[PDB]
Amino acid sequence: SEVPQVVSLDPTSIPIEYNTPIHDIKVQVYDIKGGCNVEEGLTIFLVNNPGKENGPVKISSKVNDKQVSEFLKDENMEKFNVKLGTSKHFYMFNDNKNSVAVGYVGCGSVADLSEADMKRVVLSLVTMLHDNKLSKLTVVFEINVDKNLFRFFLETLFYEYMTDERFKSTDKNVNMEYIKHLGVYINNADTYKEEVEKARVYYFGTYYASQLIAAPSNYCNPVSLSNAAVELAQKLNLEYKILGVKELEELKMGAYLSVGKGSMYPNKFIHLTYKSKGDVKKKIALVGKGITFDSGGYNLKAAPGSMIDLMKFDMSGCAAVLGCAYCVGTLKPENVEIHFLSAVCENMVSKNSYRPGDIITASNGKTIEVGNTDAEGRLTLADALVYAEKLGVDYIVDIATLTGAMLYSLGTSYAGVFGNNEELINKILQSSKTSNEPVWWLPIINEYRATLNSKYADINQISSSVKASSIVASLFLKEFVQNTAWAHIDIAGVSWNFKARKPKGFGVRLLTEFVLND
Amino acid sequence: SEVPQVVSLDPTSIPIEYNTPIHDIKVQVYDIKGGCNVEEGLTIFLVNNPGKENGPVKISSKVNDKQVSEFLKDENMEKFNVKLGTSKHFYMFNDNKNSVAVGYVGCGSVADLSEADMKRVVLSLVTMLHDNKLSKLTVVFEINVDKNLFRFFLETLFYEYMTDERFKSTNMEYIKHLGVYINNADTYKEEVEKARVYYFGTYYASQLIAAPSNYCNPVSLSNAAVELAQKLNLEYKILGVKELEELKMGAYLSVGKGSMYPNKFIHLTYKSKGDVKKKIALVGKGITFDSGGYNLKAAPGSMIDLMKFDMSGCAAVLGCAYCVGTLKPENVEIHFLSAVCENMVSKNSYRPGDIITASNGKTIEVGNTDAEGRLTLADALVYAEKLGVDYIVDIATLTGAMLYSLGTSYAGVFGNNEELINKILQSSKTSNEPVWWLPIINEYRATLNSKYADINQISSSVKASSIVASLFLKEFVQNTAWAHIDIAGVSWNFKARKPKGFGVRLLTEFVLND
Amino acid sequence: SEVPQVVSLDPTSIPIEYNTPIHDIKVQVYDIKGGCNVEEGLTIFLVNNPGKENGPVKISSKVNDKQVSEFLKDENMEKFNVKLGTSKHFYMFNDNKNSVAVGYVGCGSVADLSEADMKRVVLSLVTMLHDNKLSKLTVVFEINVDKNLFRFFLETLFYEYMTDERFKSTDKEYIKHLGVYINNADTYKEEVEKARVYYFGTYYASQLIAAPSNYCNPVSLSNAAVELAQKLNLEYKILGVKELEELKMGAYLSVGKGSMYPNKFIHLTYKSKGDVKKKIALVGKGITFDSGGYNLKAAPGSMIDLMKFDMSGCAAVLGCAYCVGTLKPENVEIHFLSAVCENMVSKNSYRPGDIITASNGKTIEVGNTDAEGRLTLADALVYAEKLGVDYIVDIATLTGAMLYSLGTSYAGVFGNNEELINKILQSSKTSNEPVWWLPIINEYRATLNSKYADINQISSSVKASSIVASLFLKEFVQNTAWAHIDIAGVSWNFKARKPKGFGVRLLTEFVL
């Protein structure tokens, strides 16, 4: 529980902001049919023009104000177009003679708006919120979006609006003033109202996971992260248990322990549990990769493009699980038992570090020849999957920044999912669709399995020949699940937003939807 | 057209073996429910042991021979195990006193054998043949295979058995009879002659791919297509530089600029002898050699010595053309396309940064001359859609990124139509040439937005080169069903140091089963 | 104070030779207006020939010897030329009939000789000293040199003549007298002992730099500074980890985290005895060894075996402390600062991506553990400005890019004050340690803008790292004249396989 220090200035806990300015925002949903009120703050219309590519702006919604309605006519709006991402700001006086702010965001020419498109819409909106000291934002939906897409709008709005300033001292912002009220005008409002607080919950679950990932490795270490996980479970009322080295030694988790050997921070295995109240019908184990930092070990990340400075994100799998625990813990689904697992450790270079060629013994008795100390993620997950299967669970779903090859496979937008079961994979894909976190199905090719045949150990950690590292890794993971439905989500490519220089908190909504939609 | 020479010793044609020793093999299929006759040749049993991993060998089938039956009892065969690929064969005299050879090949503990599993068995079997001077091989199937897997067995057996000696010189003779004992033999008989056809289509493509680039050039390869079309009776037309200039195929022509061999656009055609109901265009990448151009393949692992294989897509199309021309399917019109050229380093070569104009008017900013395949395919796809077809399917060793994606076993398929892709995937299953569906992610498309040209050839940032290339290709098909099969990883058999002839059976099953 | 050991054979102190064979050399300066006596030893004439490139040698000086004068006539000397660096030895009997050795060194055809020219002159002369068991060296200046260049001749003569054998278990006759014949001898005499002082300050810096990282560590080096301050008479204080924690020097401490050697902040002080009118703080980068950390110097050309030199800035300041401590200037107060530590790979090491907090409250996102010098200099600079000084000047082997900028001969100087830079440049001319002024380009500053911390350690795009580093440093000086001398390129003499001791004379001329 106590975080070890080298100097007295070393942080002993990960700073966590629970009460975000977003949670202070009062969200009200009105039916657009009853007319719009252009009173205080900024009012933004989400407008499209089907068919006409980059067509003119036409405000369909009825506005309950003669001066604002006259301003927003068609003859005045024709000079602006609905190009996706386009925004405009308006200044005018209403019937009361008050300075009001009005504008719009282009939502393109396509009806059924996409998901990447919506993010561009949201980002465009956030630009209008930034550098402007508003108190209320009013969004008018002159487009049709299903309940899932609507919730996604708020989730993304909250997340992109929110700025992480935990580590600013002298460069904090002077002009950061979040709105206090959010008005939403949409048709058939009563069906969308339920999605607001669902969106707010998903927001923080994602934002919580984002905060953990964003925190540097000196702040976020195996101990402080486990402490933060405990603190989260306590606030939610989840059963929690943190296993230390002695307990892990008795469980004979040789793969997991070997990775953490070179670290000054003791291994910490996180095990949170949510037990729905009543007739538990589904038992689920969520496993997340929890490497607080990945130096690569003696196979040091010294090669160009290894991006060692980024490897604080290597606990994103773990962060996704904890963010989910919040959403699950808050929303309180019924008829489900969920285990949130993460074998947390740090991959470092030391006299105590494990060496290339070292043969270790996993907790299931299988001996593993280490071919590369930088392939540690599959080593920790191996023991984690054994732990998970021992729980007697129905579904085992691991999520991990496992292979860099994912950048060459699916890239930065789509995550890859592997598995040994077609129904479990289909549920992940279905959860991917409704959670609005894109994932693509990749194959586990058994012909490659022969390249893992060790001369001395039971199985090789890595392949010498096959360069399909994403599939080979899955072949390795597949060996540590004997008779349980298992899916593997590789989020190495999608976890970090290279453009925004911040985490996505990817997986939180996907996993939560996976649990809820079951 | 005559192949140009630097010296008189430079070859002017690709040597091709049309009449292979495989074609001389008489195949006989018997039903296993009746006992085996072990008179002549070599007799091999395909045996497994479900449950018992690496279990002992048990010959279930009754053998009509007293001396061989003693050999095949349980007490002697138990000393052998069924580990996948393991084999043993002994030489002995039968009841009449003739020298026969008997043995087995291990087929593992899993029932439903895969194709890689089946391939390993065949390899094990072929090793015994490369060490055999006799006349007959008899294979006894004590394992379960559907009609497709059995046909795949023969296809693979024929393909692996055959040895390419065109470039050798300067210990065996091929068998003349093949005996097969399998259950429900009468249903599998139809697959025998189909397999032999699929065999040569693959092996033909292999010969083209295996042929060095000094032998196989844009001229000699185009000549070979003519030679193939003439033997089959396919409408053929080879477009030269002047016609390609008039068609304004600027991307395609720019790639071949640095080559001493003129560009040759291959257009073969199979028209059914009736009412064409589906019209299909098959486009194949035809780079006879890929040096990479001024973006030279000098980085480690660039494998420039391998880049004769860069015409494998074309080889697949030609191989398919063989099968289609031979099998003669009905109600279909098929166009076999390949923009053939050579990517070389010269004063005449095209440069990085060059902006070129494709035949559809779109300008392309070249970011890397080693990405020449998509440039040639760009014009090839434009040519295809003008043909007015229902399906356009390109196949090409396009991206090395496939090696990190699916590897050397599975090829990747992209497309703009889900039904066409499903037809390809269904075709992958029956041909047993494995393909996995990969996504065209439209979010990446913005990275192809050039500052000066209409579209970028490559992305500066996004390293998912396999998806970006597909995004590029998609720009040259406007309103036609199009699929893209990336076979860069699967085309060459690195362990065996030879081509796979990948795509031939995949594409042929696609046209036939459609 | 006590140096930690892994094995008992690990050294606990930097061997230092204070009394070099150079110091036992009795130096005599005579005015040439009166003739040279070719009595004993080797006598070498420094000769020029204006206009002709490699023209003949003509010895102008009067020699108080009939036979040597006849030998040194024009008809005999014409077969030799004055090509810059050329040397010749002569054998002859003098008037009393004693075997004396005489010769010359070519000084080219150009009047105002440069420094590379003079070094070649000095080096060529040293060659005659190394293969000869001589007892006396007499140098006659038949060329024109200002008082400053003359001192440099002696400086370079002393430094190159001297051989460092501290780490030899083998070995293998320094001269005891040095005679100098020059016109206006009475003005050059004052430069004689000044050169000897500048010499050792330089040679002192060389010894510290040349000393391997197992000998010269944060503790042993800090001990040497204490030892140095004591042999002088400077107020000294070495801050250890506990007080540095209370001063909250988080950037500096993070770099030393992975080391077996505790951080040691060197703070020597020279306070004049009168009305201190200028207060100066000299900060030196003090990395006793630079492994690069988790961003290990594993790439080809990283020259990791050289990274013992990464304390050259500190060695320069200490060398300055010696010269200043010896010459004792008036009306000046000088603080000699150096945040000494070791950048190593360990479980305790700081990681890439780590956010640390400097002593001025600014949070820093570490992008590369091999950019540790600016991290240590940041806290050192905050400490420096707290002293309330007029000038803050740091000197450091900070960026390897300097080899691509100015190379190995010229050092780069950056700053936020133009008058301070001109004084540094002015010192470069008189110290004869070449320095070129480089710009701090504010357009690059945006590349140091961190997403989470106050400021980034490194830039993502811009490869002008020497400038980027300077932009980082500028953030830790709020309202004080500050100059930064990047000596990564000039610190090591790659051809001679030894340190240059660069910066010592430059800084001393700046103070004095």
Add this chain to the structure above:
Amino acid sequence: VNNPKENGPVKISSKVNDKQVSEFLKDENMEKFNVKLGTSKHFYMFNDNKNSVAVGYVGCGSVADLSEADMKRVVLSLVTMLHDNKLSKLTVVFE
């Protein structure tokens, strides 16, 4: 506009010969925007004539004597508004 402090509020010094825009360019209204170098906002409104006018600002930082890299950032910020606007006339006021 600049604010000699750092990322401080926007204050329009210039007198505007328009009652409606002057109301917009008031201190109470421009205070919500800051002068960070390159930051910009433009609004659309009707003037006294009831014509659609577009008004805005570009932040020129807190330093007086603008550099050359500084001016480019200002210009780019200005150019972005031109590329996203079907305007006919651009008016730049140098405060």
